[PDB]
């Protein structure tokens, strides 16, 4: 696994078992996350669930997170949140500022037996997630006039960039793309770009080619298979907009998109759908995002096998057959059911 | 009687592409006459040309992205003249196989301003901010030529797109002033915003609930791009731009082909198609109303159609099958 | 700059409002002798009980119209003039009519030069008025100095940039002596202290009335409050061949419209195609020196002068008997050779 | 006439802001002074950590201001100037002061009189900064064609008014060009094409440091940004004599507050009755010219600046050994016999 986000494993002396972090989070959350907890249970997986809540507090008019949450949080060196509300200062902002989490990764792969416009898209994307065109930097320079400043510096390009050639190298993608703008960013794309091509070296195993996020979105949509041996890396903004992109080929939605936010002793992953309050509590919700995710965070940990049980069978080969699936994807199924059905060829 | 518009080819499968066009123009015997230039700062000539002129027809010039590299001069062209507002047009056409078919949205993007601002500096070393600077001035003014723009070409829906729940002064600014002039101006008109992020994925997935987008300089060379695709490529988009009293027209995709260079693959629809708004433009338009039908005729009429639709004729060919079509009509 | 007219890439967006009566089709006339000379102009043109809030809107937009005349009620449940609706919602303050003989026209007195400014938003134009009790009617004119004061200067600065020698105010003010009487003197007031150059003089409505039929050409610049304007207006609209031969234009500080100098709609020949656009297009013209074009305006100004000097192909009204549209194609014809 | 100062049958209400350190004190020696000539203003007095909010709101209804500096954090939690909060917020953009050498004051070099004209809301006081990475900072410093234009003609406007030769524009043009550069370009700019009588000159801010100091007699007006005034202001300020002898006013289109012209807090002797008040009352002088008095400013003024000429009875920081209290009954002592 990536050398610059690595887990500090030892299962806790007194169980055969890992420690996790939760965080339930609200709305069809809770039901969401049983679900992977019984289908983790099922598979035997050396874990137990320490569940923390990060409802924030607000010390100094700048809104920080519990202590409860924290201590647990630092010390398992991992967490797996759900979706979560909007309850003054991003909450997802001040969880990655407090727990150092800088790259999100995000991969957008087509599901077996749900049809969508687009076909055989499996992509991979780093996203620098710490500063870039989202530090809170702004001016009004004067009456009618507004500055925005993006902010791009070596320290913080080059350990997402690291992450990208090491992620690329740990799922076995020949390729790493760096998605940029030098042509009107000069310096603060080209810095980025540069600080790619310097690593470049250190990775002779792996391809480092550059792209402007001109093609990378013109190539992509018009064939999102021309990236299957992708993992690109890119500034705060492009990774935003390419990812909600990459996934709206894939899914159409991002109902079944996992994300993973990296830290540099930490990590936490999570499901990037919203806290569908409407649905919650009927049952309907549909765990395969969060679950996707828990893959992601098994193989983060070093627990190969169990993700790619939990994965490669189980859950992706049990979304097919309309009797399972879900309401969001033309089945039929309940979260209850899925859940099951699911850990049948667990 | 005779218009005399400014010609700039630039790099790529520009010289071809552009080409095409005069040949179709003589064949055509329409009444203008090219003044052409060709140029590392003669960027100057092309706009001292064009304020003679007021009009002019271009392909896309190209960008080094090194550090000592010179910096757009596409942009330069556009900012030294306030040629303030690109238009690129995605529209599906008949004999085109696209995933998403039946297709029609425009995407209308400030050109002078946001991102496009070019300030940077790198305050010590390993640092570097680039300054991204939104004005009212500016933005109210695009705001109403996208409105303006909807009117007069009956659309019925505006939206803005931006990052306003992140940059909050800059993006903010751009969503309210656009929505907050078209309710108080333009009321007959839909007016929304929309998360650029979002409007990325809709714009690939669900791409039909949009009809006009307004953007700055940035979220516009992103979602014109998935617009280029959506509809077949870069090929197949007929752009625009306008200033209060200038007009260049070029390709809406933005691609300068450099690697077919020469080869005569090229596929000239974007141009001629951008050729024709500018006919339409100078009043013609008889021929405008023409040309196209012929293009578009073409290209929906199986094989002789050039090679990236997916036929296997070359610009040349293809060119010839627009004039014959042409000859008859 | 969100203040000059609308503009795009050469093009300017102007509104067009054609009206009632003839209006449909005088406007037309225009639109064709416009495509066919290939003026960058694009219409935005509006149609018709209340959304004379859509014209508003439109020419807000714009900052300019070109507009035939609306049709007005004179039953008590009409809706009322909604011209000057028009005008006073966009505070277009000043009405310009312009008065000069035609070669190519009989008229009684030949020879004729003479322009008419009013003041479009006041006087007995201010539309209030009630019953007190039944039988008994009170209508209430308003003059105020800052409306007069405005005016007032319009008046000598268009004079001077016309190179008019002489302005005239028209009153009543021996009989409404604070009204009319404030009107006359604010004008010659600040025609003594600014505007020294050009002579300033008085008359008196009703003789000026008579001297304006028996005497033109003592007259150069006239300043009126509402009423007076409408009349001097239609003196001078028939001394010169009539209503279809005057130009006239409305400004505001910020917007301009431009219609016929005479005011009047021609409901009875709608659709007739026997309607005379001399009117609707000199003042086209108008608007084009406006906007700074004015090639165009010196042009085809001189193609309808000439055409209607040589005698027939010109239209009913003036003594011909070709119709709109064959004056209208002599006029794009003259217009093709020049 | 909303827009004169604050005014009822004969009698002004005018804003008073004590402010912090001996600015209570100083104030109170005007007001003794005033009632005592029994001047017909009213004082609406004020007293404050965001309340800067009823000082403005105050002002904004009369117009007129007298005040004494409140005091400033240099800590990082502390709440920033708001003295420059009151300024920026009434678009107060113009700052005077008057270093002119007095009568019985031993000063280094003698018979001096310069004025320094300084920019109140922008510049380095534009107060835009932030911290990129941990232990960097950057400070933005904005320069507006606006707003220095503005300056610009003030300046010039009030040297034409006082019968002041030459401005000059102080900068550091050769270093910052773009920043100081449109500063003095504009300046010298629009004192040729306007203002041809005026002699305009530049002089680099360290430079005119130096000359300041060494040989101040060749200047007249300075025209300055934010800090360069700062600055120039207080070596003009000791080669008068101190703090406590410097008439200062701030100016903006619609508002006007009058405090002292060297900007010192004096917290270390608040409450002792040591303080000199003559800064404090000679702008207050200034306010009385302003609202049109100035028979009274004529006259107090001269109480004053004999009464300090006049040997002891002096207040301290001039090398008397009177306090705050007797120094104004000498004033209106003198005042009592004119
Ligand atoms: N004239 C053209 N016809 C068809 N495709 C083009 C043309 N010019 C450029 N392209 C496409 O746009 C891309 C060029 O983008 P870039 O790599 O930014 O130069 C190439 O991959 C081409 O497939
Ligand atoms: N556009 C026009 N040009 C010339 N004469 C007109 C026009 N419109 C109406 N008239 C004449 O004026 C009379 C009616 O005027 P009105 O008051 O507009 O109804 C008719 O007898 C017409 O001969
Ligand atoms: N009323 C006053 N007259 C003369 N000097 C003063 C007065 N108030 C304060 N000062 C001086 O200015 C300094 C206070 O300014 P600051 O450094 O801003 O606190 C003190 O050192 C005093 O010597």
């Given at each position: 696994?990536?050398?610059?986000?690595?887990?500090?494993?030892?299962?806790?002396?007194?169980?055969?078992?890992?420690?996790?972090?939760?965080?339930?989070?609200?709305?069809?959350?809770?039901?969401?996350?049983?679900?992977?907890?019984?289908?983790?249970?099922?598979?035997?997986?050396?874990?137990?669930?320490?569940?923390?809540?990060?409802?924030?507090?607000?010390?100094?008019?700048?809104?920080?997170?519990?202590?409860?949450?924290?201590?647990?949080?630092?010390?398992?060196?991992?967490?797996?949140?759900?979706?979560?509300?909007?309850?003054?200062?991003?909450?997802?902002?001040?969880?990655?500022?407090?727990?150092?989490?800088?790259?999100?990764?995000?991969?957008?792969?087509?599901?077996?037996?749900?049809?969508?416009?687009?076909?055989?898209?499996?992509?991979?994307?780093?996203?620098?997630?710490?500063?870039?065109?989202?530090?809170?930097?702004?001016?009004?320079?004067?009456?009618?006039?507004?500055?925005?400043?993006?902010?791009?510096?070596?320290?913080?390009?080059?350990?997402?960039?690291?992450?990208?050639?090491?992620?690329?190298?740990?799922?076995?993608?020949?390729?790493?793309?760096?998605?940029?703008?030098?042509?009107?960013?000069?310096?603060?794309?080209?810095?980025?770009?540069?600080?790619?091509?310097?690593?470049?070296?250190?990775?002779?195993?792996?391809?480092?080619?550059?792209?402007?996020?001109?093609?990378?979105?013109?190539?992509?949509?018009?064939?999102?298979?021309?990236?299957?041996?992708?993992?690109?890396?890119?500034?705060?903004?492009?990774?935003?907009?390419?990812?909600?992109?990459?996934?709206?080929?894939?899914?159409?939605?991002?109902?079944?998109?996992?994300?993973?936010?990296?830290?540099?002793?930490?990590?936490?992953?999570?499901?990037?759908?919203?806290?569908?309050?409407?649905?919650?509590?009927?049952?309907?919700?549909?765990?395969?995002?969060?679950?996707?995710?828990?893959?992601?965070?098994?193989?983060?940990?070093?627990?190969?096998?169990?993700?790619?049980?939990?994965?490669?069978?189980?859950?992706?080969?049990?979304?097919?057959?309309?009797?399972?699936?879900?309401?969001?994807?033309?089945?039929?199924?309940?979260?209850?059911?899925?859940?099951?059905?699911?850990?049948?060829?667990? | 009687?005779?218009?005399?518009?400014?010609?700039?080819?630039?790099?790529?499968?520009?010289?071809?592409?552009?080409?095409?066009?005069?040949?179709?123009?003589?064949?055509?015997?329409?009444?203008?006459?090219?003044?052409?230039?060709?140029?590392?700062?003669?960027?100057?000539?092309?706009?001292?040309?064009?304020?003679?002129?007021?009009?002019?027809?271009?392909?896309?010039?190209?960008?080094?992205?090194?550090?000592?590299?010179?910096?757009?001069?596409?942009?330069?062209?556009?900012?030294?003249?306030?040629?303030?507002?690109?238009?690129?047009?995605?529209?599906?056409?008949?004999?085109?196989?696209?995933?998403?078919?039946?297709?029609?949205?425009?995407?209308?993007?400030?050109?002078?301003?946001?991102?496009?601002?070019?300030?940077?500096?790198?305050?010590?070393?390993?640092?570097?901010?680039?300054?991204?600077?939104?004005?009212?001035?500016?933005?109210?003014?695009?705001?109403?030529?996208?409105?303006?723009?909807?009117?007069?070409?009956?659309?019925?829906?505006?939206?803005?797109?931006?990052?306003?729940?992140?940059?909050?002064?800059?993006?903010?600014?751009?969503?309210?002033?656009?929505?907050?002039?078209?309710?108080?101006?333009?009321?007959?008109?839909?007016?929304?915003?929309?998360?650029?992020?979002?409007?990325?994925?809709?714009?690939?997935?669900?791409?039909?609930?949009?009809?006009?987008?307004v953007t700055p300089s940035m979220y516009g060379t992103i979602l014109g791009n998935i617009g280029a695709a959506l509809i077949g490529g870069p090929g197949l988009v007929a752009g625009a731009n306008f200033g209060r009293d200038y007009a260049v027209f070029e390709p809406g995709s933005r691609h300068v082909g450099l690697d077919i260079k020469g080869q005569n693959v090229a596929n000239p629809t974007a141009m001629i198609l951008s050729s024709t708004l500018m006919l339409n433009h100078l009043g013609l338009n008889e021929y405008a109303t023409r040309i196209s039908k012929a293009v578009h005729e073409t290209i929906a009429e199986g094989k002789h159609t050039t090679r990236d639709i997916?036929?296997?004729?070359?610009?040349?060919?293809?060119?010839?099958?627009?004039?014959?079509?042409?000859?008859?009509?």
């Amino acid at each position: 696994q990536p050398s610059i986000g690595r887990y500090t494993g030892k299962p806790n002396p007194s169980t055969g078992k890992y420690t996790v972090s939760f965080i339930e989070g609200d709305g069809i959350g809770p039901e969401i996350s049983k679900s992977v907890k019984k289908i983790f249970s099922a598979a035997n997986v050396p874990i137990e669930w320490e569940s923390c809540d990060v409802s924030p507090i607000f010390v100094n008019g700048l809104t920080t997170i519990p202590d409860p949450a924290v201590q647990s949080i630092t010390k398992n060196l991992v967490a797996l949140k759900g979706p979560l509300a909007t309850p003054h200062r991003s909450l997802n902002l001040t969880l990655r500022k407090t727990f150092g989490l800088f790259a999100n990764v995000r991969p957008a792969k087509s599901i077996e037996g749900f049809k969508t416009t687009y076909e055989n898209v499996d992509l991979v994307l780093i996203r620098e997630n710490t500063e870039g065109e989202y530090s809170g930097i702004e001016h009004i320079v004067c009456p009618g006039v507004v500055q925005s400043i993006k902010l791009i510096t070596r320290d913080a390009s080059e350990r997402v960039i690291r992450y990208a050639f090491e992620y690329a190298r740990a799922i076995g993608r020949p390729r790493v793309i760096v998605v940029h703008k030098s042509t009107i960013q000069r310096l603060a794309d080209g810095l980025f770009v540069n600080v790619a091509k310097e690593l470049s070296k250190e990775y002779p195993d792996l391809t480092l080619e550059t792209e402007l996020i001109d093609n990378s979105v013109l190539k992509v949509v018009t064939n999102p298979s021309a990236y299957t041996d992708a993992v690109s890396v890119c500034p705060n903004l492009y990774g935003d907009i390419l990812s909600d992109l990459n996934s709206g080929l894939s899914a159409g939605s991002l109902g079944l998109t996992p994300s993973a936010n990296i830290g540099h002793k930490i990590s936490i992953f999570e499901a990037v759908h919203g806290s569908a309050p409407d649905i919650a509590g009927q049952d309907k919700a549909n765990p395969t995002a969060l679950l996707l995710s828990s893959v992601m965070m098994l193989n983060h940990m070093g627990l190969t096998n169990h993700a790619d049980q939990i994965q490669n069978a189980v859950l992706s080969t049990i979304a097919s057959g309309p009797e399972n699936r879900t309401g969001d994807l033309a089945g039929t199924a309940t979260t209850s059911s899925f859940t099951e059905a699911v850990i049948k060829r667990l | 009687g005779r218009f005399t518009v400014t010609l700039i080819p630039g790099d790529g499968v520009g010289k071809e592409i552009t080409d095409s066009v005069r040949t179709i123009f003589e064949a055509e015997n329409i009444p203008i006459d090219w003044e052409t230039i060709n140029i590392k700062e003669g960027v100057y000539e092309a706009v001292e040309s064009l304020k003679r002129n007021k009009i002019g027809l271009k392909g896309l010039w190209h960008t080094p992205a090194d550090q000592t590299g010179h910096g757009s001069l596409n942009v330069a062209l556009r900012k030294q003249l306030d040629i303030y507002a690109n238009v690129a047009l995605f529209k599906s056409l008949k004999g085109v196989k696209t995933r998403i078919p039946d297709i029609d949205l425009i995407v209308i993007r400030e050109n002078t301003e946001g991102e496009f601002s070019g300030l940077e500096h790198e305050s010590v070393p390993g640092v570097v901010e680039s300054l991204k600077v939104m004005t009212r001035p500016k933005t109210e003014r695009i705001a109403r030529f996208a409105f303006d723009f909807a009117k007069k070409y009956n659309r019925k829906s505006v939206t803005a797109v931006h990052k306003a729940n992140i940059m909050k002064l800059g993006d903010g600014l751009f969503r309210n002033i656009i929505t907050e002039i078209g309710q108080k101006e333009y009321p007959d008109i839909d007016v929304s915003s929309i998360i650029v992020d979002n409007a990325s994925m809709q714009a690939v997935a669900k791409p039909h609930q949009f009809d006009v987008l307004v953007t700055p300089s940035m979220y516009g060379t992103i979602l014109g791009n998935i617009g280029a695709a959506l509809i077949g490529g870069p090929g197949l988009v007929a752009g625009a731009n306008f200033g209060r009293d200038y007009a260049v027209f070029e390709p809406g995709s933005r691609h300068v082909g450099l690697d077919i260079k020469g080869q005569n693959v090229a596929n000239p629809t974007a141009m001629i198609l951008s050729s024709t708004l500018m006919l339409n433009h100078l009043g013609l338009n008889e021929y405008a109303t023409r040309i196209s039908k012929a293009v578009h005729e073409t290209i929906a009429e199986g094989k002789h159609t050039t090679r990236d639709i997916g036929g296997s004729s070359s610009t040349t060919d293809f060119t010839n099958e627009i004039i014959n079509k042409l000859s008859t009509m």
